[PDB]
Amino acid sequence: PTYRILKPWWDVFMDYLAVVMLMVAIFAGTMQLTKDQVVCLPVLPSDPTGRKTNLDFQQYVFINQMCYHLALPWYSKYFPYLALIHTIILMVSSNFWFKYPKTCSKVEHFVSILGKCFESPWTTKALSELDKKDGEQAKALFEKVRKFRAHVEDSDLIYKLYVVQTLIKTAKFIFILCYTANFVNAISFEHVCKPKVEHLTGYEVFECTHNMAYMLKKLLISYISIICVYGFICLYTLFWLFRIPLKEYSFEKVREESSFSDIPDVKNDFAFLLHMVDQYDQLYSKRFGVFLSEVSENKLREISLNHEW
Amino acid sequence: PTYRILKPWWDVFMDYLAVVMLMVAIFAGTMQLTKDQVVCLPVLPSDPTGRKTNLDFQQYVFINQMCYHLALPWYSKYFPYLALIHTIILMVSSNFWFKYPKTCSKVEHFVSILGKCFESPWTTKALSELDKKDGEQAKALFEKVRKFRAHVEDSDLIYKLYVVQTLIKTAKFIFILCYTANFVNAISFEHVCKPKVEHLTGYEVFECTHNMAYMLKKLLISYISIICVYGFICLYTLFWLFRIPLKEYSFEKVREESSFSDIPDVKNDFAFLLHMVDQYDQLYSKRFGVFLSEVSENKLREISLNHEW
Amino acid sequence: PAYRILKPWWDVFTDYISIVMLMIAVFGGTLQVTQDKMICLPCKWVTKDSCNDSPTGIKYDLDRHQYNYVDAVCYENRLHWFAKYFPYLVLLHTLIFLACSNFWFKFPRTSSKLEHFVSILLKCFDSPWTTRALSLDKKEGEQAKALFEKVKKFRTHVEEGDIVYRLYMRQTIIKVIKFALIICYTVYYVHNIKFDVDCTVDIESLTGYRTYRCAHPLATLFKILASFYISLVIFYGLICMYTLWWMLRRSLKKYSFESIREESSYSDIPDVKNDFAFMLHLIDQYDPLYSKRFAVFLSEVSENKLRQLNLNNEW
Amino acid sequence: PAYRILKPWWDVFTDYISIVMLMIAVFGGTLQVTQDKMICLPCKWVTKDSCNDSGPTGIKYDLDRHQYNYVDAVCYENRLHWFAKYFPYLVLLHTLIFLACSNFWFKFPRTSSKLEHFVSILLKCFDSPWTTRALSLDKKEGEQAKALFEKVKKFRTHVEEGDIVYRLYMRQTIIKVIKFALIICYTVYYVHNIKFDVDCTVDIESLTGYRTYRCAHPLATLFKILASFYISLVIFYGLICMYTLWWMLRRSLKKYSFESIREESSYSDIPDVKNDFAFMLHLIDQYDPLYSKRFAVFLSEVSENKLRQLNLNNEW
Amino acid sequence: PAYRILKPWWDVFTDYISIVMLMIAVFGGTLQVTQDKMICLPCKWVTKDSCNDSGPTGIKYDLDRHQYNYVDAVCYENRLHWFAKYFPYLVLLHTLIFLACSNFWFKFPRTSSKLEHFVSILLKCFDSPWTTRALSLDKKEGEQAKALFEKVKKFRTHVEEGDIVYRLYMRQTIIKVIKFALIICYTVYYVHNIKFDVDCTVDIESLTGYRTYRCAHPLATLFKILASFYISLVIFYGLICMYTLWWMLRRSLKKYSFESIREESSYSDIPDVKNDFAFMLHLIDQYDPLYSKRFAVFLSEVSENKLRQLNLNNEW
Amino acid sequence: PAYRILKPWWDVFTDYISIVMLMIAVFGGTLQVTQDKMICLPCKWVGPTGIKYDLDRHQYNYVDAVCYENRLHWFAKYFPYLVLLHTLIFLACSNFWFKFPRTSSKLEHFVSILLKCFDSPWTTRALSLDKKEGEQAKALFEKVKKFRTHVEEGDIVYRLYMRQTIIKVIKFALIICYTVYYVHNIKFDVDCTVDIESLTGYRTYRCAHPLATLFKILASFYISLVIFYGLICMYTLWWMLRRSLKKYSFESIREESSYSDIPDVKNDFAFMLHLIDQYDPLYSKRFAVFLSEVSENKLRQLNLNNEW
Ligand SMILES: CCCCCCCC/C=C\CCCCCCCC(=O)OC[C@H](COP(=O)(O)OCCN)OC(=O)CCCCCCC/C=C\CCCCCCCC
Ligand SMILES: CCCCCCCC/C=C\CCCCCCCC(=O)OC[C@H](COP(=O)(O)OCCN)OC(=O)CCCCCCC/C=C\CCCCCCCC
Ligand SMILES: CCCCCCCC/C=C\CCCCCCCC(=O)OC[C@H](COP(=O)(O)OCCN)OC(=O)CCCCCCC/C=C\CCCCCCCC
């Protein structure tokens, strides 16, 4: 969909970190349904020889299941699903600002006209300072840009949607870092189980060992590190968003670089898309600036009239 | 198809919720054949030592199967399949209002003529206040939209079908909330069974545990929360349909904005699509409404006369 | 691709039903391969014909492999074959239905005729001459003349043959016969999917017990899948019977152009026959717009007007 | 794709039968790898080579789990018939051989180049408006038609001189039919060995304690059903190949006559092609004769003369 | 894609044999992952150095199930032959090596660029109407033909000097044939060790209580069958590679002669080419001589003179 | 695809070696997650008959789990996960300059301009006239001049490539250090003392690792692949540091071609042209036509001749 122009480097890094987090969550959930198990042995009273517990195989299985659903804490068995939910939430918000239908149509029109301006030779002719069909195409693209300027600059939906998206991402990162970090050392290999099923097996206290505890702890540490990098990138994005006021876009530098100075000050959502493209590459910003100049309009009209006469 | 013009934001959110519920249902069904084992131990009559039940391993598996078939209720066994059926029904009924072939054609050519209005430079000229081929295209589009008005504005089929679809969605949500929340606390971890297999094992009463009980309850709670969000969105849709009478549409603000003030009052279905468009984008509504004014028709006729003479 | 215009609503519904049936077959086959087994416990009281009903656990003194052998033997012998081979029969029926529904799309004669018809319909539907006739350069005129000649060649090539209509009728007949046979045998053999099965396999020389009481864990789920498959077969048969009634209610080998010639400005379009008529009936079932746009090239008056316009714009 | 015109109804039927048999082979191999075991129990009463058959209480054999597993493995390796063990692998090999024999002429470059050139030329002649006008022009269309006439003439003197495609197709049909004969011999002869209950005398008495064991093959009936289905599909494949061979040998496919086409059309001077040209035109006739009738325009000299006259008309 | 013109029949056969061998490697690897194990039973009566053979009742070993698992693991690690354990991994490595040797000149950037340019220019010349006109004029077609003549001349003066492609193909063929020789030596020498019954003496008497155990390898027969089939495929691959090497060394492929073209066609000024261009022309002729014959017209000064004469004729 | 011209032979070799490494990592992870266990038997004393331990099966499973998670070396347990992380790092660093937007836009522009110049017949005419061809040729000349004046000012691509190569080579050094140092710990039989006598009754257990030999073989093959990868990265560093890639020389091209006024390019332009030369010098030679001013003068003269 050629949406990579709109996404800056920090957004690409956030998307790739979300992909890696989703992969980690899926891998953790694969093991949490394949080999997630606890093995429990009863605490018996006091040439070495083994201790006979007088328990059947299925009594041991019953004890294991009961202690898995009672002794094992919720964060030692539900982390991969919470990680999957968090990755889904982060990935949905990542593409949300161009998936909402109004903003999607606006950004699609913006990308289309930006590509048309980039492929327009009239921009190169104006920057360096033709044909009747080329002049007609240039006039049509100028009129399309004129219609687009009134279509987008009136509203501020895209900027507000992006602000809401990054605020939601930052809040989710803060919540994940606050609640996940408190439950790191709480994951332990051994677990003391008191299932109160002595009338079925004969033992009151069972000592269990969660098999998927150390690997789950390493995956938790890796997820915490990745989400910390993600939060740092999101905080940098917030600082950039609140650094430059994106409600307006001064073309003073563009009008100074170019030979045309009749470029209006683009504001609102039209300014936000131009700022994102400038964060991507300033060439398209120069193209739009020279296509928004009235002196270029006068030059194009004069060229068309000279072609006609 | 570009159906997003007539598809409001709440419809897209309902489709997203349906997709998420489908994913939750298939995830539950995946584990419904993975962790569905039911470990059962007999209730035996009254230094610590293990309790000897004198049961073989095959006897234990037989009791497990017997009390999985008997003790576990249907909502603890076939829950994800019912959720899958509900998600399939919701996905089928998501786009019911324009799945009807007559209304499908009406919506398709409505989007076509709206796109023609957007692309036509005569709309831009009217908003500001040309080639003869463009004038003929404008005349053809004027005749086409007049035929559209005379053909669709008389009836109200699409509005009735949309009301039917949203009432069906509301009724389905109410049924799901009533039926499914009745079995929230009914799902229990442990089940006591009396499978009457004393002639095969010697014990009449067995005590069991369901491995996929707490996880199933968590997934049920999440599914009920998502369907509650779906019902809230549906209730907001009903509130938006009832607070504003959609049987008619007035362009009074559009008449005041433009110099032309001969826009008629659109009623019936022709008003429902325009209301949906105005919710999607009021600029498209204005660009269509400047066509319905007879002053624009008179100006087009005057331009045609100037071209002819 | 472009063959979607040849499938009416009943064909699309049968395709969706076959897809759901194939999903059911895959699900049942996965259950059969993975989680299908039996758990049989011997009955020490065999006074009656079946297992007899008669605290501490009962000791059978049987090894694990003796239990496995008993389960395997009572799964092989005293379990009804419908419960064991339910998803395989469903898979075979889905393969037969998919072969029958797509037989004419792969038979070379009917596939070639359908491809030619679809290509000609695509050429005629995008032709500006049809729009002009309903409501212009000499290159467009000669292209329309070539399209008219190709339409005449198609008429004289396919109007004689009747392979497509006969093959479609045979496919519908085979499908409805298969539906009748399935509804007979599946419903007749659906009461044998029991959870509890009593087996008397006479392996006393290897185990020591005569009669065993088994339990089929997937019996209830297979019964639910069998009910779902029966409902799907019933819907499939109703759709196929509607298709057969549509084919036999009126002659599909003859197509009437009275409505089109009355609606349009041309009243000289003759009736087509055989595969041409059948394909036009299928088009009318899908969309009458294609037939209305295509009927322009079946009239000599349209050709006369086209050549008159060509002579007009030439000079 | 573009090669669907070179596959008659028998070729499509063989392709779909091969696909079904390949699915059968994959399913059987998945069952053989995973589910195929052999539950064996010893026989305490022995009166002959086979196992003897003779409140109630269970019989105790005093065998461990691993002794039972060892008995199962040894009686699976020794006294289980090879056809039941390697049934899906043979089916997979036969399906691979059939697919190779069906796609050899499409993958062998000497015949693949000729087939693709013939298909390209036939499709370029089929879409040319000059064929429609001749069966019933612009200077660019006229020179394109002249170039296509020259290309057809160059193609005819290049392919008609050899008969490699016909020889390769005949050899493929012969190999397929003899493969079907060998399969329908050996598979049918050895299909009776897939039985549920097999007795073994594998002589592991020094390890377990018993001489004879009576086993059970859980997948015996399912493998027997799959073998019956594979035999039926092989029978259908062989009948189709017999029809193909009879069609090839009934009339000489290395000699094509346009007598019906030249009688229907005005042109009665169409030459008779031979060898690979004749064989490919026979294949096209078995697919659809419209392509052959449309291609017959470019062989007639009268159409070439008419094209030359039109080129002279539009040249000046 | 369009690279099939550079792959002769032996290259296609080697590619398909490598695909089949890769499938065998994957099947053996998943068998090794899933159900590769040993079932070991101790021998209580040991009179010889190895295990000794000596109503009936089962022999009691008084071993736990995990003791049996430990014995199986130890005798699988120590006294099972390495070939029976790592057979599919060696096959996978050999298939990867063969595929790398086949696609090295496809992926090596200098030879890849040379092949891309050669294929593009050959396909442009094959569709050029000037070839048909010469072997038997629009201004745009004449300009395109002149540009194609210039491009062919530049390609000849750029590629004919270097011999990287022929050298790389020779090195790939030599590496493939010596790899085949090493495989057919070591695999054949080590194929006898894949046997069902394996006797182990691993000295775990302190943990278990017995010294010698009689093990069984359930996958030994299937691994031996797969090894035999892989040896047969390697033999076929080596025969194909030896034929390819004999074809390379039989004639100097760095010297292509157009003697047949200059003897049959009117244009007799076509000079002989050398090095990579000659080798690529030989490969194309092995695929289809029509492409080489159609490409040979651009290497003649007479054809260019006729083209420029026609350009001057239609220019004024 | 279109960006393969910017990948020299060392980049392709590193990509394929990393693909093989990723396959090894996936296979090892599949083995470790599913099949990896540790069968343990207690040491009773720190015709033949079996030794009885009076241990239940679940007691054996508990002992196996405890001695697998306690006294087994960390490298034997987490071998393929480190390999997977290293493969992901190598894949990210190899194509980091294809994902950074500032360098990605320049790479896209360079590839598109190079392809357009290669497909143009004006280069063939110069090395040896429709109005559209001349118009497209002069537009290509103008956009080539714009590309040169836009790219030559900055050297972001060369610095990023140098950083990626340095990161890759130091990662290879770290891998070939730590993996080699921790490769002897993968052994079959590992004794464990976990002090669970209160639960089972034995102190020391003699364990066995079923996948120890296969993990060791995979580690050895991964070490060999890492050695090859490091040798290729060392060659890449030597190629980068042999010549100043910020400056490109057109002396051979201007001497071979008729034009002898081709200026030297700097910064990312020179680095990209060096990469193209390492791929194929024909592309750079054909692109060198649109840099000489004499070619522009000839094109203007031909346009004027077509005008008159
Ligand atoms: C992108 C695709 C991949 C995504 C990631 C996938 C990761 C997992 C992939 C494969 C592993 C599948 C098997 C996992 C088994 C784990 C162990 C386990 O669950 O053991 C218990 C398990 C459950 O028994 P119950 O059903 O409770 O018995 C009830 C009796 N009345 O044991 C058994 O069934 C026996 C062992 C056989 C396998 C069990 C799992 C079967 C899973 C799914 C079956 C349905 C699949 C449907 C889709 C099929 C598509 C071809
Ligand atoms: C000749 C062609 C060969 C083709 C290749 C075949 C071999 C494939 C290679 C490897 C497969 C590895 C599978 C590993 C699975 C996990 C390990 C394991 O041991 O699993 C055992 C586990 C349980 O086995 P049992 O306990 O014996 O089952 C109860 C009855 N005794 O196995 C399974 O769960 C079954 C096997 C794996 C899943 C198979 C799923 C098959 C699904 C569908 C087939 C039927 C429908 C087909 C529809 C087709 C529509 C186009
Ligand atoms: C770190 C990198 C990333 C790792 C990602 C790992 C993803 C894992 C995804 C899915 C697997 C889910 C569990 C599947 C099994 C479920 C049942 C279970 O837990 O165990 C069953 C059972 C346990 O093993 P045993 O049969 O006891 O083995 C006896 C001999 N040692 O599992 C198995 O047998 C194995 C199941 C998986 C088989 C996979 C087969 C294919 C893999 C590798 C073979 C080689 C492929 C080569 C490809 C080359 C391509 C060019």
- CB-based contact D62:E204 (threshold 8 Å): no
**Under 8 Å between Cβ of A76 and A187:** yes
Asked whether C29 lines ligand 1 (CB < 6 A), one says: no
**Strands E255-256 and E197-201, bridge-based pairing:** unpaired
Per-residue tokens: A164: 């809401």
Tell me whether strands F191-193 and F204-208 are parallel, antiparallel or unpaired.
antiparallel
The answer to whether the Cβ–Cβ distance between C215 and B62 falls below 8 Å is yes
**Among A140, E158, A129, which Cα is nearest to B124's?**
A140
| Residue A260 belongs to some domain of the structure | yes
Nearest to A148 by CA among A252, A265, A292: A292
Task: Indicate if the alpha-carbon torsion angle E95, E101, E104, E105 is positive or negative.
Answer: negative
Task: Go through chain B and list every residue after which a break occurs, taking a C to next N gap over 2.5 angstroms, comma-separated.
Answer: 46, 129
CB neighbours (10 Å) of residue F306?
12
Breakpoints of chain C, after residues (C–N > 2.5 Å)? 54, 135
The CB of F30 under 6 Å from ligand 3? The reply is yes
Structural domain including B192 reads 3-308
DSSP E218-287: TTHHHHHHHHHHHHHHHHHHHHHHHHHHHHHHHTTTTEE--HHHHHHSS---PPPEEHHHHHHHHHHHHH
What's the rounded Cα separation, in Å, for the pair E176 and E228?
20
Please measure the distance between the N-terminal and C-terminal CA atoms of chain F and give it in whole angstroms: 43
Q: Which residues pair with A39 in a beta bridge?
A: A209
Task: Give, in order, the Cα–Cα distances in Å from A89 to each of A171, A273, B12, F112.
Answer: 12, 24, 17, 37
SS3 D270: coil
* R_g of chain B, CA atoms, integer Å: 31
Rounded distance, CA D26 to CA D32, Å? 10
Ordered alpha helix ranges (H), chain E: 9-35, 65-77, 82-107, 109-126, 129-135, 139-159, 164-189, 220-250, 259-264, 275-287, 289-295, 301-315
Specify whether the CB–CB gap between F144 and F117 falls below 8 A: yes
A267 assigned to some structural domain? yes
DSSP 8-state secondary structure symbol assigned to residue F35: I
- Side chain identity at E102, as an amino acid letter? S
Contact F124 E151 (CB under 8 A): yes
B114 token code pair = 């709206």
Q: Which of C68, C84, C207 to mutate to test the interface with D (most CBs of D within 10 A)?
A: C68
Whole-number Å distance between alpha carbons of E303 and C50: 98
Alpha-carbon Rg of chain E, whole angstroms? Answer: 31
Strands (E), D13-71: 39-42
C-beta separation of E279 from E166 below 8 A = yes
Start-to-end CA distance of chain B, whole Å, equals 42
Q: How far apart are the first and last CA of chain A?
A: 43
- Ligand 2: lining residues by beta carbon, under 6 Å: C 26, 29-30, 33-34, 37, 91; D 25-27, 29-30, 33-35, 88-89, 92; E 30, 34
Q: D2-47+60-315 in CATH: which number?
A: 1.20.1440.80
Residue F300 tokens, joined: 């203007």
d(CA B132, CA B135): 5
Distance separating alpha carbons of residues D189 and D201, to the nearest angstrom = 24
H or E segment to which residue C42 belongs: strand C41-42
Check the CA dihedral E147-E148-E149-E150 and report its sign.
positive
* Identity of the residue numbered B112: S
> How many structural domains are present in chain A?
1
As a whole number of angstroms, the distance between CA A194 and CA A206 comes to: 6
Which own/partner pairs from A123-130 qualify as long-range (CB within 8 Å, at least 24 positions apart)? A123/A287, A123/A290, A123/A291, A124/F139, A124/F142, A124/F143, A124/F146, A126/A258, A126/A259, A126/A260, A126/A290, A126/A293, A126/A296, A126/A299, A127/A258, A127/A286, A127/A290, A127/F146, A128/F142, A129/A259, A129/A299, A130/A303
Q: Residues 6 or more apart from B151 whose CB is under 8 A from it?
A: none
Residue D163 in tokens: 């008969």
CB contact at 8 A, D43 and D52: yes
- CA angle (D183 as vertex; D181, D187 as ends), nearest 5: 130
Quickly tell me which residue has 């509890």 as its tokens: C196
CB of C60 closer than 8 Å to CB of C42:
yes
| B–A touching, 3+ CB–CB pairs within 8 Å | yes
Strand partners, A192: A207
Distance CA B3, CA B97 (A): 12
**In which element (H, E) is residue D262 found?**
helix D259-264
Structure tokens belonging to residue A166:
């990054």
User: For a substitution probing ligand 2, which of D30, D31, D36, D91 has the most ligand atoms within 8 Å of its CB?
Assistant: D30
Q: Whole-angstrom Cα distance, residue B42 to residue B63?
A: 9
CA distances from E163 to A8, E122, E274, F157 (A): 47, 19, 8, 34
Q: How far apart are CA B305 and CA B299, in angstroms?
A: 10
Q: Rounded CA gap, A114 and A152, in Å?
A: 14
F42 exposure class (CB count in 10 Å sphere: 0-12, 13-18, 19+): buried
Name C297's Cβ contacts closer than 8 Å, sequence gap at least 6: C124, C130, C147, C148, C151
CATH of F2-307, one of 1.20.1440.80, 1.10.10.10, 1.20.1740.10, 2.60.40.10: 1.20.1440.80
Query: Residue A42's beta-bridge partner residues?
Result: A206
Cα–Cα distance between A26 and A81 in angstroms, integer?
8
Shortest alpha-carbon distance between residue B176 and chain A (Å): 23
- Backbone φ and ψ of E212, nearest 5°: -100, 135
CB contacts, 8 Å: F202 with chain A: 48, 50
Per the structure block, which two tokens stand in for D264?
């229907």
Sheet holding E197-201: strands in order across?
Answer: E39-42, E212-216, E197-201
Q: What is the DSSP letter of A55?
A: -
CA-closest residue to ligand 1 atom 11: A34
DSSP B193: E
SS3 D256: coil
* Helix or strand (DSSP H, E) at E41: strand E39-42
Length of chain A (residues): 309
Q: Give dist(CA C215, CA A232) in Å, integer.
A: 58
Min distance B22 CA to chain C CA atoms (Å): 16
In whole angstroms, how far apart are CA F138 and each of A89, A120, C39, F144?
A: 51, 14, 84, 10
The backbone torsions φ and ψ at residue D4, rounded to the nearest 5 degrees and listed phi first, read: -70, -20
Under CATH, to which class is C2-46+60-314 assigned?
Answer: mainly alpha
If interface means Cβ-Cβ distance under 8 Å, which residues of chain B face chain C? 33, 42, 44-45, 53-59, 61-62, 65-66, 68-69, 78, 198-204
Q: How distant is the alpha carbon of residue C295 from its chain centre?
A: 31
Q: Which long-range contacts (CB under 8 A, 24 or more apart) does E187-193 make?
A: E187/E90, E187/E227, E187/E230, E187/E231, E187/E234, E188/E231, E190/E81, E190/E83, E191/E83, E191/E224, E191/E227, E191/E228, E191/E231, E193/E81, E193/E83, E193/E84
Report d(CA E144, CA C40) in Å as an integer. 83
- What residue type is C228 in one-letter code? F
Which residue owns the Cα nearest ligand 1 atom 26?
B33
The helix/strand/coil state of B207 is strand
* Inter-chain CB proximity B59 and C195 less than 8 Å: no
Q: How many other C-beta atoms lie within 10 A of the C-beta of residue E56? A: 16
CB atoms closer than 10 angstroms to residue D316? 4
CATH class of the E2-50+62-315 domain in this structure:
mainly alpha
Contact indicator for D190, D83 with CB cutoff of 8 Å: yes
DSSP string, A159-205: HHHHHHHHHHHHHHHHHHHHHHHTTSTT--SEEEE----TTTSS-S-
Q: What span, in angstroms and rounded, lies between the C-alpha atoms of C296 and C264?
A: 9
Structure tokens at E177: 């044939």
How far apart are alpha carbons A197 and A199 in whole angstroms? 5
Q: Is C160 helix (H, G, I), strand (E, B) or coil?
A: coil
* Helical spans, DSSP H, in B129-250: 132-152, 157-180, 198-201, 214-243
Residues of F in contact with A30 (CB under 8 A): 33
Contact E203/E74 with Cβ under 8 angstroms?
no
For ligand 1, mutation pick of B30, B32, B34 (most atoms within 8 Å of CB): B34
Residues from chain F contacting residue A20 (CB–CB below 8 Å): 88
For the stretch F89-127, what's the b/e string if a residue is b when 16 or more beta carbons lie within 10 angstroms of its beta carbon?
ebbebbebbeebbbbbbbbebbbebbebbeebbbbbbbb
d(CA D133, CA D136) in angstroms, rounded, equals 5
Distance from the first to the final alpha carbon of chain D: 42
Neighbours of C9 (CB within 10 A): 12
Strand partners, F207: F40
Report the alpha-carbon distance of residue B175 to residue B99 in Å, rounded.
24
Residue type, A33: L
**D279 in Cβ contact with D160 (< 8 Å):** no
Instruction: Quickly list H helices, chain A.
Output: 9-34, 57-70, 79-94, 101-118, 121-128, 132-152, 157-181, 214-243, 252-257, 268-280, 282-291, 294-308
Whole-number Å distance between alpha carbons of A112 and C39:
66
CA distances from F244 to E26, F268, F270 (A): 47, 12, 9
Compute the C-alpha angle D106/D107/D108, nearest 5°: 100
List chain C residues with CB under 8 Å of B204.
55
Identify the residue whose C-alpha is closest to ligand 3 atom 40. E30
Spatial CA neighbour of B193 closest among B63, B79, B78: B63
What is the distance between the alpha carbons of residues B121 and B300, in angstroms, rounded to a whole number? 13
Per-residue b or e along D205-218, where b marks 16 or more CB atoms closer than 10 Å to that residue's CB: bbbbbbebbbbbbb
The nearest alpha carbon in chain A to F51 belongs to A49
A72 C-alpha to ligand 1 centroid (Å):
23
Integer Cα distance of E311 and F231 in angstroms: 57
Q: Are D261 and D143 in contact (CB under 8 A)?
A: no
Give Cα A301 to chain centroid, integer Å: 45
Cα distances (Å, whole numbers) of residue F157 to A280, E83, E227, F93 = 15, 50, 51, 13
Tell me the two tokens of residue A25. Answer: 């969550």
The Cα–Cα gap between E280 and E292 comes to 10
Query: Does residue A4 form part of some domain?
Result: no
Q: Where are the domains of chain C?
A: 2-46+60-314
Nearest to E6 by CA among E116, E95, E100: E116
Residue in the structure block whose two tokens are 């049934």 = D87
Distance between E53 CA and the closest CA of chain D, angstroms: 5
Distance from CA of C166 to the nearest CA of D (A): 17
Phi, psi (5° rounding) for residue C79? -120, 135
The verdict on the CB of residue F33 being under 6 Å from ligand 3 is: yes
A200–B51 CB contact, under 8 Å: yes
Q: List residues of F whose CB lies inside 8 A of any A CB.
A: 33-34, 42, 44-45, 53-59, 61-62, 65-66, 69, 78, 81, 88, 99-102, 104-105, 135, 139, 142-143, 146, 150, 197-203
Tallying the residues shown for chain D, one arrives at 316
Closest to D153 measured CA to CA, from D298, D12, D29, D39? D298
In Å, what resolution does this model reach? 3.3
Q: What gap in Å lies between CA F71 and CA C33, rounded to an integer?
A: 39
Nearest protein Cα to ligand 1, atom 16: A34
- Output the six-digit token pair for E38: 């040993």
